[PDB]
Amino acid sequence: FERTKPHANIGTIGHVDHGKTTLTAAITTVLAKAGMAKARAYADIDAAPEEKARGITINTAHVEYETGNRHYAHVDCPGHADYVKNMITGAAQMDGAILVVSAADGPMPQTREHILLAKQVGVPNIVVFLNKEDMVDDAELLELVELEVRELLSSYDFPGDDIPIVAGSALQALEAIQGGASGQKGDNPWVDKILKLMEEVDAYIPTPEREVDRPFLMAVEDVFTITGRGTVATGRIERGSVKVGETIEIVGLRDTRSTTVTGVEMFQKTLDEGLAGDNVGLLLRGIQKTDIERGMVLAKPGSITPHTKFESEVYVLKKEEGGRHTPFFPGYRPQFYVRTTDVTGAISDFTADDGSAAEMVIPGDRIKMTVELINPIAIEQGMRFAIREGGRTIGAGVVSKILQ
Numbered sequence: 001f002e003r004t005k006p007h008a009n010i011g012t013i014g015h016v017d018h019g020k021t022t023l024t025a026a027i028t029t030v031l032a033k034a035g036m037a038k039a040r041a042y043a044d045i046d047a048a049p050e051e052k053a054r055g056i057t058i059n060t061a062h063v064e065y066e067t068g069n070r071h072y073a074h075v076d077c078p079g080h081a082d083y084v085k086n087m088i089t090g091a092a093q094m095d096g097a098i099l100v101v102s103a104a105d106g107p108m109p110q111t112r113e114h115i116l117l118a119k120q121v122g123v124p125n126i127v128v129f130l131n132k133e134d135m136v137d138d139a140e141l142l143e144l145v146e147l148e149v150r151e152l153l154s155s156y157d158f159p160g161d162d163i164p165i166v167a168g169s170a171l172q173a174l175e176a177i178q179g180g181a182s183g184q185k186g187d188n189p190w191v192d193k194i195l196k197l198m199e200e201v202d203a204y205i206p207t208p209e210r211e212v213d214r215p216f217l218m219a220v221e222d223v224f225t226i227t228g229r230g231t232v233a234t235g236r237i238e239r240g241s242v243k244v245g246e247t248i249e250i251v252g253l254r255d256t257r258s259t260t261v262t263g264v265e266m267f268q269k270t271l272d273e274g275l276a277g278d279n280v281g282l283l284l285r286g287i288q289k290t291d292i293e294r295g296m297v298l299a300k301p302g303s304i305t306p307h308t309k310f311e312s313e314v315y316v317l318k319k320e321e322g323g324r325h326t327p328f329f330p331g332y333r334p335q336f337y338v339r340t341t342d343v344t345g346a347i348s349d350f351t352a353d354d355g356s357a358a359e360m361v362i363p364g365d366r367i368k369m370t371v372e373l374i375n376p377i378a379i380e381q382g383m384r385f386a387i388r389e390g391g392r393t394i395g396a397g398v399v400s401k402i403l404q
């Protein structure tokens, strides 16, 4: 028996004015007829609030709803910049994305850019809604837009042959419900296309693995000497779990070493097991406090490795949001905040979206670049980091490819 329906995190991406917010409203309104959502008006979702987090401001609407199969958290954002920042900082988990493409316009530059970013930041799967079908009276033209979108997806290494594409009209489905449509399949053809979209989302976007089932990872935040037999390392477990008696690795800054966990402690609790989300103190056999420091991580052995050089997608903050007025440039050497500590690094090999070399990336823009750190640290694809100068965040990045 499953006590709770499965959960996924998704969002609407795509070019401005293609219909992302109207589709979000239509999904909540159609599912509200079944009792599975609070209906959210376009005007409400469109007026997305500001959210600030770790020095980065984004405008994001959040809606929740469920289908018969799965519960969803769904993000929608007003502007292209909001998507760039949300995807690079990972402010919303995206287990998949609904790409909205207007059938009247076809793919546009932010269609391409949002697919690029979805690939680079690791969004697993995409479903497409080909919106504004009411504006296109020729089935021939709709098939040509579908093929163009499949080719675009394939060019960013998504499986363009397998991605579900559902055509319809978010605006006509909302108007149909307003005019009395029941929300039952077969009652209205525009509502049926929203139901079909959510059937495809349910079937094609995988439910994420539970965090406690992934390989253990904990960033070390503080360290204590209490007995002569080991050091207590404290932090918040990011994923997985750790049990007394297990071998773990200490990764980053010094050569990788293994130790046995001989105790797990929380306030007023002596535990056999620490779980993802828990703030814990772990007793590490044989480790001296001098061997271990902030910036290191504890991990299931072999599950994460130390690295110094990687490709990343980087966003440069505008002065208005707390950054600097000056562009990032090759050989700039700022600080990289990697989970718990600054590491000096140098940036290089700026690569524009068309593959050509770039001279700089200006504030408010994003680009692919290479980072080389002065010291090795545990790095994996999808890891986020901040770029800092004097403790203020001036950029944000996500690891897209390990190089060394």
Ligand SMILES: Nc1nc2c(ncn2[C@@H]2O[C@H](COP(=O)(O)OP(=O)(O)O)[C@@H](O)[C@H]2O)c(=O)[nH]1
Pocket (backbone or CB within 6 Å): 014, 015, 016, 017, 018, 019, 020, 021, 022, 023, 078, 100, 131, 132, 133, 134, 135, 168, 169, 170, 171, 172
């Ligand atoms: N004809 C038509 N207009 C639509 C449709 N969906 C959205 N629109 C209109 O297109 C404009 C942009 O839609 P919006 O949802 O704000 O786009 P977003 O910028 O992608 O969030 C609005 O005026 C919508 O009413 C549709 O299916 N058909």
Ligand SMILES: [Mg+2]
Pocket (backbone or CB within 6 Å): 020, 021, 022, 046, 076, 077, 078
């Ligand atoms: Mg919108």
